Design a protein around this nucleic acid. Sequence first.
RNA 1: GUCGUGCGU
Length: 694
Amino acid sequence: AELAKQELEHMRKRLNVDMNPLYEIILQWDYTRNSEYPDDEPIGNYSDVKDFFNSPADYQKVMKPLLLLESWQGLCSSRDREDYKPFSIIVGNRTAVSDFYDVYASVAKQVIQDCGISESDLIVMAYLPDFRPDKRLSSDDFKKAQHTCLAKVRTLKNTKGGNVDVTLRIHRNHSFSKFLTLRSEIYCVKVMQMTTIEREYSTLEGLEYYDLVGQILQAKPSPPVNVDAAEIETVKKSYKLNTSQAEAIVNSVSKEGFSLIQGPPGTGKTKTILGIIGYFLSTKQKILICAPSNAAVDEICLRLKSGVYDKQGHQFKPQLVRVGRSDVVNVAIKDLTLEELVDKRIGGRDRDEMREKNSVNYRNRDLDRRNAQAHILAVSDIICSTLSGSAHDVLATMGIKFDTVIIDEACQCTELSSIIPLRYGGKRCIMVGDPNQLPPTVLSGAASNFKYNQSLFVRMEKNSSPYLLDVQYRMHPSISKFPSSEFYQGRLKDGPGMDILNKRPWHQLEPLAPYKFFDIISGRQEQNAKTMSYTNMEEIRVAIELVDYLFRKFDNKIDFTGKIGIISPYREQMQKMRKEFARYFGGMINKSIDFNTIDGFQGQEKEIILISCVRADDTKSSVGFLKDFRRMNVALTRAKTSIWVLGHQRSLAKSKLWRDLIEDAKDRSCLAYACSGFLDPRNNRAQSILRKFN
RNA sequence: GUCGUGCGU
Ligand SMILES: Nc1ncnc2c1ncn2[C@@H]1O[C@H](COP(=O)(O)OP(=O)(O)O)[C@@H](O)[C@H]1O
Ligand code: BEF
Ligand SMILES: [Mg+2]
């Protein structure tokens, strides 16, 4: 009775967290400020992430400055790199709420749709008396303007005549409120989306009431619980795994608390997660799986679609729900999307009466949609999503409790992101990740200097040794020669027959080999003025030529549906690659080929991988974030059979890591020279250039 | 100095 009441109180407190302080602090920031910190407060306030936290208060005190710094850096990046479409609104009556002012304005529905303004968005508002209506309006004008105020879009209500009543929450003490006179035109432009930041702040505040708060603060995973070897052998036989994976699965399931599995790429980490899920289901209980990147969630959903084996070995297919939008979610698992499942479940005076009937019908449809969504969530056993999406409003409103949580690629997410899914009464958490992989995507170098980029998995590994996996079953041994010898200094043993099972017909051809490094003799990349992202068309052309040659050689012999992937460190480079591939081939690229980034492609598996090195210009003299060993390791660990690296030898040779990689490739005679039309006998210019370079 | 992200009414 009393215990249940306390548990319910804690659950509602964790789900319902006051967001007012977050806005009160963020809204005081100056949009026009050009600095690496939100304010001019002493740097001594910020502190490095402590390995051990005495109490939740200390953890919150340490994390809050880092979270604010990360939010400020993201806001600055959106201000510079992102360029939305500014709009104008008419100021209305202002309502005074707790240390805040809510302003109601009338906006055009078409303008709102074009600008993509939602109820969880942040905007910057300015007063420009000298602005010319004919003159173009952009973020540059806001940067130049000195009167800027941050506002939060609290709600968006559509009124008659296609007019939206936008409510904007701002800080009282901000001086810009003096410009918010009634019937005044204010130019507002979107900045960024605060949903992720809001969820992170809510989790940070509610960590006090989390069941595993003590373990997180102490960073001490529950001690291993000894289990009979018979169970381990039975699990290994049923799931056709190895001894290490079976032992890790048994240890993780047997003991409550935090269980960390550290497995380099290709060591069955995803297969280990699937085995854990199957074993738990065999032994109603709902399990929540969260991955930092949507690609990992899509891969997990695709793998689960094939079925899950139990201890007896029989394969069963549980109901899996993907919490996300169709656009971000992959087309292959589009059926598993929650919205698609809900759609499948159901799918004068006279004018006033007709309007009332239409409104009643719409309300009934909304109620039916809510009921179908609730039924799908309740019946479903596996809920796969992302860390940011794990705190979806629907899940919080439903109130269902997830006693088992899995965090895939825990090293790719910050502590707050990894802890977000634990708000739902998480008593058992299993984190799978390899520290050598890419770190969490942090836009602030200062925050990383304070160990903000450090993930909870890394800290837990430092405190105690996780369950280690040293056997791989994906990467070709030749491909894994260099990554294992350099990054891991060994400790990674290839499978008994990886080479035999990785043999492919195109490997026989000299141009195409399991491992090959192609050099761009003549290649330069242009940095975008706004996004500050490099991009070179030479690598795109070379990749297109390689793909066309591979298809022509083995068009009908072997189908390449979902077997060729191209990873580029730069978003702009990936977008250009996809656009040019669509222009050249057409719709086949939608299925036969995939395009992604190294961080966005982390965890993905493809038979053929093309790693595009954007930094193809020697005059730059800098390789960029690629210099880090984790980036190269993740990029190289994507190929299962064939890996092709495109780049400029001179530019990459400057960095020690790429220099060593090129030397290793030369030792194995895997180095190659490529250019425009280097595989075209007609294009004798390419042959002449190759001969001259040699 | 540039790599990610949350929603569908
Ligand atoms: N015991 C095994 N027998 C055969 N194949 C295995 C075994 N364990 C793992 N594999 C293969 O190795 C691959 C492991 O990939 P994984 O390491 O999960 O990728 P990522 O590191 O991106 O998560 C799987 O695709 C699976 O087919
Ligand atoms: F360790 Be794998 F690259 F997800
Ligand atoms: Mg995995």
